[PDB]
C-alpha cells in the first residue's frame, strides 16, 4: 500500500522520515509502535506518524 502526505512532518530521530504535503510514500507497513508506519520516500525507508498521511485506495 502507498500513502499520501497531508501534513508536513520533520524527523526527530535518524530512523523517521521528513515528509511534505503531497508526497507519496511507497510500500507502507503498519508497525508495533502504535500510530507509526514505515515506508519509502525518495529511495529511503523510515518511520512516520500515521495521522499526517492518508492511505491511497
Amino acid at each position: 500500500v502507498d500513502y499520501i502526505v497531508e501534513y508536513d512532518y520533520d524527523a526527530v530521530h535518524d530512523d523517521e522520515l521528513t515528509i511534505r504535503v503531497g508526497e507519496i510514500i511507497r510500500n507502507v507497513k503498519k508497525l508495533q509502535e502504535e500510530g507509526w508506519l514505515e515506508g519509502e520516500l525518495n529511495g529511503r525507508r523510515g518511520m512516520f506518524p500515521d495521522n499526517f498521511v492518508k492511505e491511497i485506495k
Binding site: 501534513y7 530521530h13 500510530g35 507509526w36 506518524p49 495521522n51 499526517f52
Partner: peptide
C-alpha cells in the same frame, strides 16, 4: 520512546 506527533 516515541510520542504520537500532533497535527
Amino acid at each position: 520512546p516515541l510520542p504520537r506527533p500532533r497535527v
